[PDB]
Ligand binder design. Structure first.
Ligand SMILES: CCCCCCCCCCCCCCCCCC(=O)OC[C@H](COP(=O)([O-])OCC[N+](C)(C)C)OC(=O)CCCCCCCCCCCCCCCCC
Ligand SMILES: CCCCCCCCCCCCCCCCCC(=O)OC[C@H](COP(=O)([O-])OCC[N+](C)(C)C)OC(=O)CCCCCCCCCCCCCCCCC
Ligand SMILES: CCCCCCCCCCCCCCCCCC(=O)OC[C@H](COP(=O)([O-])OCC[N+](C)(C)C)OC(=O)CCCCCCCCCCCCCCCCC
Ligand SMILES: CCCCCCCCCCCCCCCCCC(=O)OC[C@H](COP(=O)([O-])OCC[N+](C)(C)C)OC(=O)CCCCCCCCCCCCCCCCC
Ligand SMILES: CCCCCCCCCCCCCCCCCC(=O)OC[C@H](COP(=O)([O-])OCC[N+](C)(C)C)OC(=O)CCCCCCCCCCCCCCCCC
Ligand SMILES: CCCCCCCCCCCCCCCCCC(=O)OC[C@H](COP(=O)([O-])OCC[N+](C)(C)C)OC(=O)CCCCCCCCCCCCCCCCC
Ligand SMILES: C[C@@H]1CC[C@@]2(OC1)O[C@H]1C[C@H]3[C@@H]4CC=C5C[C@@H](OCCC(CO)CO)CC[C@]5(C)[C@H]4CC[C@]3(C)[C@H]1[C@@H]2C
Ligand SMILES: C[C@@H]1CC[C@@]2(OC1)O[C@H]1C[C@H]3[C@@H]4CC=C5C[C@@H](OCCC(CO)CO)CC[C@]5(C)[C@H]4CC[C@]3(C)[C@H]1[C@@H]2C
Ligand SMILES: C[C@@H]1CC[C@@]2(OC1)O[C@H]1C[C@H]3[C@@H]4CC=C5C[C@@H](OCCC(CO)CO)CC[C@]5(C)[C@H]4CC[C@]3(C)[C@H]1[C@@H]2C
Ligand SMILES: C[C@@H]1CC[C@@]2(OC1)O[C@H]1C[C@H]3[C@@H]4CC=C5C[C@@H](OCCC(CO)CO)CC[C@]5(C)[C@H]4CC[C@]3(C)[C@H]1[C@@H]2C
Ligand SMILES: C[C@@H]1CC[C@@]2(OC1)O[C@H]1C[C@H]3[C@@H]4CC=C5C[C@@H](OCCC(CO)CO)CC[C@]5(C)[C@H]4CC[C@]3(C)[C@H]1[C@@H]2C
Ligand SMILES: C[C@@H]1CC[C@@]2(OC1)O[C@H]1C[C@H]3[C@@H]4CC=C5C[C@@H](OCCC(CO)CO)CC[C@]5(C)[C@H]4CC[C@]3(C)[C@H]1[C@@H]2C
Ligand SMILES: C[C@@H]1CC[C@@]2(OC1)O[C@H]1C[C@H]3[C@@H]4CC=C5C[C@@H](OCCC(CO)CO)CC[C@]5(C)[C@H]4CC[C@]3(C)[C@H]1[C@@H]2C
Ligand SMILES: C[C@@H]1CC[C@@]2(OC1)O[C@H]1C[C@H]3[C@@H]4CC=C5C[C@@H](OCCC(CO)CO)CC[C@]5(C)[C@H]4CC[C@]3(C)[C@H]1[C@@H]2C
Lengths: 318, 51, 57, 41, 43, 318, 57, 41, 43, 51
């Protein structure tokens, strides 16, 4: 009866909890904000982005690239709204990656992704994601290549849960169920996560039940500097790597540098060389082989000048 | 368990949907943008990179 | 006599190893200081010029 | 004594694990102790 | 080799049990803040 | 008798001729000043140069590099004087390249070069060069690995002659004699060169008697811009390539760009990012394969600030 | 009937070839304009700022 | 007529020589005519 | 195969003749400006 | 034609000269510089890269 639900929720709200965010973001500050891993590239790269409006967000992008595992050309377009976000990008070889996110409810959103490769049968993947963001938790279920055609379920199904335990501590869970086909038995994995977040530092751990462990620590070293440490241990042979890095935010540039136990040094400099133009320098150095990989990239955004008067749409479900 | 004809036809729908997605997904986004952006750009300018 | 010649070879292996480590260690320290210190000093130095142009207003 | 520090840290099957755990502990204590800010900021 | 008809049962059951205890764990976490708070209140 | 020599030289001087320079410099303005060929590199490179004096010139250099066919480290030192120039550079692998140039007379100079590779027997080369610069000509003879040990001459002997015909036109010759050993007969080649040089444009041609032809044209396009075209034809199969390029001299940077008939585009930007520091960006693009090679380099010169009062030594025979 | 289907295939080969050339030609023109025009515009643009600072003296 | 311009310029053993000689002639005439300075300077 | 004793003579002579005419060409070039000037004077 | 002993000894001189050049050439330049440059640097500063 509602008599319990009303009293139960009132006690729940008195605990001062907040939404802990996604399980995949539990270590975002180290692995994405401080570390270079997601910004590293080699060769030449150029992105030309034209923004046609901010509400609804609509922009078109052309990427030219010549480098390791970089497709020569990629056309992209995105359309955003407070309730929806559609994105598509296609390679010169016809590989199409699509995104369609829709807010059915302010708390419930469905994310649909397709990957279509024409030249190679490869993986033509369909991923159906359902996220619920509660007052103090978030729950997600992903279905990747779901099928019932063989008379039984097939594909990869991932459940995720993250719960705020205290205003600082969140604990969570991820569970996977897999079956390549009815010829084989289903495979299941469980991962445990947790995070302690304060204003100046954040600690996170990801524990795969099969033996892998990822621990990360982030700390703000003043207004312009932040640093973080990322340790990955695999004991499934035994392998361990620790990456330490720092990020500096200047008025017109951001500098990142990191070193890791495998002797790899890498740095990324992003520099606002002009009002619409941002240059990127990325360098990777392996001290064991004395080999370096250098990436120079440019980004230009024509659209914004005319549209600055108009305002970006709130809560686009990217 | 299953049905042979039902599986054959269902798979055929997926390859129709796959082809429609492959060819129609980006033109769809461009249509949503072109008709709902404020202001509305030109058809040629809609795909111009920096002009 | 031969006892000295063996010692000479024993020294050469260890000393050549020592110089290779010292030279290899010096290279990585230099390359690390360059790849980190050069972009940082240019980025940090430019930031200070903007800070001066603001203070002079 | 010192020989037991070398073997488990550089020439054993689990030595890679030990090296990364030590590097993680040192980096966190460097940051958390305030020495990093007094030097890097 | 391919699994026999009851070896699939073992795999299908073992997979089901892991997912049943995963959802059971998420239920414990959801109720956990009421428990953690009480210990602080006792302190 | 001197009666003829005095009258002969007086008529010679009345012709208004000047020293035409070296045969190897007959196309310098295109191939070295405008084109990118000698500045192109890939990967990371750093040169640290300390100058200890300008008269006598003495400086020490450390090069660090990680790239294609770039040795990880190179120590170098040079000492210069109006009468002599000694230079040595040695790799991390012990490859020593040496130079010793001495002005026996203001018109006559001997250049000695050694290459010593310890790890590989390879080529341990000794090159003995003798240059004479006359009032209107220059003559050179090079001996590379000369030997009389087998009872007969062996090695590569190159004679060069360049003659000013008019104040603008110089014509020249290069002749080679080769013998790998007394087991085989001597091989001889002749090359013809010429150049027409004016203030705004320079035309050069190099004609190998065996069939290769190299034509180049340079033109100054105003005070800050110069351009040049380089054609190489080989008819020994038949192969031809034409490279067109331009160089821009700005206050704090020099930009070079070139394209050639083989579809390769390359550019080099040299930028004075600081008073002692010069950055270099080099990018090579092959339009047939859509592959790019990127080189980022830095050069720093500590020494000059203290020594600016002192003046560089005149006529160092580099 | 089949005469139309053969013509359809004949068109596809030529048209697909035409689009591949046009797309490949457009890529090289874009990449050339970027690799030359970007460093030049930054170099030329900075040169003009120095020229302004001299004229303002 | 036009066929004789294609074969010797793109599908013959000496076509590479012809292409470079034409590219050289065009580049020099572009520079020497003053059009290059009027555009590049 | 290796060259016979008179085939080396042919190679040693042929190489000598080329170098003799190279030095002969350089002598003509050295004297050439007196010739080129005279034609201009005649004009 | 030649002499066996003369060729053996001459070649030996070249490998002596080659070893002296390989080891002594750069120290020689550094000595010429250090003793004749104006001003004269320090022995450690002589090989310092940028201090
Ligand atoms: C109006 C739409 C204009 C802009 C929208 C972007 C493209 C829209 C859908 C692309 C069509 C699907 C491509 C395809 O079939 O791929 C398989 C083929 C692969 O070739 P294949 O023949 O080997 O593969 C066989 C597979 N099928 C049967 C699907 C053809 O890919 C291509 O045709 C290559 C190019 C694809 C896209 C290249 C870049 C995008 C367009 C260029 C710039 C766009 C605007 C700039 C001006
Ligand atoms: C190893 C990492 C460092 C090696 C590079 C050598 C450092 C040379 C930099 C020159 C310093 C300078 O110009 O002074 C700036 C200043 C010195 O000036 P100051 O701030 O002390 O006082 C100057 C006074 N005002 C403000 C008026 C100008 O120092 C700093 O701002 C602190 C940072 C020190 C340099 C840090 C280098 C980059 C660090 C990146 C990552 C570090 C840890 C992450 C691990 C990854 C790295 C491998
Ligand atoms: C600082 C001085 C410490 C040591 C510097 C040189 C001593 C050994 C150098 C050597 O032999 O090269 C080996 C190393 C690496 O070589 P390696 O170990 O790859 O093998 C070469 C060694 N042999 C062939 C004998 C086996 O070479 C270098 O990189 C030279 C070292 C200098 C690098 C930075 C120092 C210059 C700037 C600081 C002043
Ligand atoms: C006082 C001199 C100080 C600075 C002068 C530079 C070096 C002087 C001569 C080098 C000796 C010859 C090297 C050699 O034998 O090479 C063969 C060996 C190759 O090893 P190997 O043993 O395989 O080759 C056998 C060949 N012999 C018999 C000659 C040894 O090379 C090396 O030893 C590697 C390093 C050579 C040089 C490396 C950089 C130069 C020095 C480092 C920095 C210098 C100052 C910076 C601080
Ligand atoms: C193909 C080569 C060109 C492709 C790049 C596209 C050009 C975009 C550059 C932007 C121009 C600009 O900002 O204007 C500057 C200016 C335009 O301004 P302006 O000088 O006309 O007047 C402006 C007024 N003031 C002086 C007050 C500012 O143009 C120039 O200075 C002339 C140069 C034109 C751009 C040349 C590009 C680089 C050329 C390098 C090599 C060219 C031939 C060699 C072959 C190799 C190349 C493949
Ligand atoms: C300008 C418009 C002219 C043509 C642009 C797209 C038309 C064809 C694109 C295509 O199919 O891709 C082939 C080309 C090269 O592909 P390709 O020739 O290597 O092979 C792919 C073609 N199939 C698989 C069908 C055989 O792809 C591209 O690079 C896309 C072209 C766009 C590049 C620059 C244009 C954008 C900016 C200008 C506006
Ligand atoms: C599933 C796995 C379980 C472990 C883990 O998730 C993964 O779960 C979290 C538990 C966290 C700790 C809990 C509490 C504190 C007290 C705090 O004290 C600050 C001052 C305070 C007085 O103590 C104010 O009064 C310091 C930090 C510490 C020890 C946390 C560190 C990070 C930890 C280890 C997190 C870790 C990532
Ligand atoms: C199981 C996995 C192994 C790795 C790991 O868990 C997961 O192990 C945990 C240990 C944690 C540290 C413990 C205590 C402190 C002291 C605190 O300082 C505030 C002062 C306060 C008490 O000292 C009184 O003022 C700052 C944070 C810090 C350094 C924690 C950081 C995160 C760490 C490294 C966690 C890390 C992610
Ligand atoms: C010991 C080893 C070699 C040297 C080294 O450590 C390792 O030592 C570091 C010191 C750095 C310099 C510090 C300050 C600046 C000023 C900045 O701005 C000037 C602007 C200009 C305008 O004319 C004057 O105002 C330009 C860059 C520069 C010179 C740094 C360059 C890199 C250097 C040399 C670093 C290099 C990695
Ligand atoms: C299990 C694994 C072994 C390694 C490790 O976990 C993983 O073991 C943990 C022990 C931690 C330290 C314990 C206590 C403190 C005091 C705290 O407060 C002081 C006040 C400060 C001012 O703020 C200075 O006065 C500062 C931090 C520090 C040193 C911890 C640092 C991180 C450490 C090294 C952690 C490290 C990552
Ligand atoms: C061994 C090979 C023989 C060819 C060559 O070396 C190699 O030797 C040179 C001969 C040169 C030409 C001689 C004279 C002129 C007249 C001048 O006229 C300007 C105005 C003038 C009136 O004519 C003033 O009054 C234009 C240029 C031209 C044709 C030269 C071009 C370059 C040439 C072809 C050079 C070429 C490189
Ligand atoms: C055998 C090899 C084949 C390639 C080559 O020789 C060597 O062939 C030559 C033809 C030459 C051009 C001929 C005439 C002119 C006209 C002049 O313009 C001044 C105006 C003036 C006469 O027009 C009256 O004012 C500028 C120079 C230019 C373009 C020469 C440039 C160099 C060229 C391309 C030479 C090139 C190196
Ligand atoms: C058509 C295809 C795509 C676009 C393109 O051709 C090919 O068109 C060219 C025009 C170039 C820009 C011209 C002028 C400048 C100003 C300079 O300085 C501004 C300083 C800032 C300070 O805030 C305002 O003062 C910065 C660079 C920029 C924007 C050029 C960038 C590259 C561009 C986009 C080139 C690009 C290659
Ligand atoms: C044998 C090979 C075939 C290709 C080629 O040689 C090699 O054949 C040559 C013919 C030359 C042109 C002849 C005459 C002139 C007039 C001159 O003067 C005009 C005045 C000017 C203002 O200055 C404009 O009004 C300008 C130059 C030009 C066009 C020559 C350009 C180079 C060319 C194309 C040379 C080219 C390289």
């Amino acid at each position: 009866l509602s008599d319990l639900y009303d009293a139960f929720q009132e006690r729940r709200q008195k605990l001062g909890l907040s939404n802990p965010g996604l399980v995949e973001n539990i270590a975002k500050e180290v692995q994405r904000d401080v570390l270079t891993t997601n910004l590293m590239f080699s060769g030449l790269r150029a992105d030309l982005t034209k923004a046609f409006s901010l509400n609804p967000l609509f922009q078109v992008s052309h990427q030219f690239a010549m480098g390791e595992r970089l497709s020569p050309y990629t056309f992209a377009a995105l359309y955003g709204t407070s309730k929806m976000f559609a994105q598509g990008n296609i390679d010169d070889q016809g590989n199409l990656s699509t995104t369609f996110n829709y807010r059915w409810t302010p708390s419930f959103t469905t994310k649909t992704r397709f990957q279509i490769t024409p030249g190679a049968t490869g993986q033509d993947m369909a991923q159906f994601e359902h996220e619920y963001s509660g007052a103090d938790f978030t729950a997600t279920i992903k279905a990747l290549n779901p099928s019932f055609l063989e008379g039984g379920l097939t594909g990869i199904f991932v459940g995720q849960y993250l719960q705020s335990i205290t205003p600082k501590l969140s604990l969570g869970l991820e569970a996977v169920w897999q079956r390549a086909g009815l010829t084989q038995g289903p495979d299941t994995a469980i991962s445990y996560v947790g995070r302690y977040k304060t204003e100046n530092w954040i600690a996170s751990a990801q524990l795969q039940a099969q033996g892998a462990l990822n621990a990360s620590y982030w700390q703000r070293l003043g207004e312009k500097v932040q640093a973080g440490v990322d340790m990955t241990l695999s004991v499934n042979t035994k392998e361990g790597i620790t990456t330490f890095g720092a990020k500096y935010d200047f008025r017109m540039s951001t500098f990142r540098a990191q070193i890791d136990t495998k002797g790899k040094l890498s740095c990324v400099l992003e520099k606002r060389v002009a009002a619409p133009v941002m240059m990127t320098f990325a360098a990777d150095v392996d001290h064991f082989t004395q080999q370096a990989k250098v990436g120079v990239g440019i980004s230009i955004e024509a659209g914004g000048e005319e549209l600055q008067d108009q305002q970006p749409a709130p809560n686009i479900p990217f | 368990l299953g049905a042979d004809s039902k599986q054959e036809r269902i798979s055929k729908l997926i390859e129709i949907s796959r082809v429609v997605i492959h060819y129609g997904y980006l033109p769809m986004i461009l249509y949503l943008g072109y008709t709902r952006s404020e202001p509305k750009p030109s058809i040629i300018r809609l795909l111009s990179p920096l002009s | 006599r031969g006892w000295i010649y063996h010692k000479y070879e024993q020294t050469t292996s260890a000393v050549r190893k020592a110089l290779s480590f010292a030279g290899r260690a010096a290279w990585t320290v230099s390359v690390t200081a360059l790849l980190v210190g050069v972009p940082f000093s240019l980025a940090y130095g430019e930031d200070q010029q903007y800070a001066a142009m603001e203070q002079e207003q | 004594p010192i020989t037991g520090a070398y073997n488990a840290l550089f020439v054993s099957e689990n030595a890679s694990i030990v090296r990364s755990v030590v590097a993680f502990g040192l980096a966190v204590t460097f940051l958390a102790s305030g020495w990093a800010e007094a030097i890097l900021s | 080799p391919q699994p026999s008809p009851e070896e699939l049962r073992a795999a299908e059951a073992e997979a089901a049990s892991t997912i049943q205890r995963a959802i059971a764990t998420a239920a414990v976490l959801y109720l956990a803040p009421f428990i953690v708070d009480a210990v602080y209140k006792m302190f």
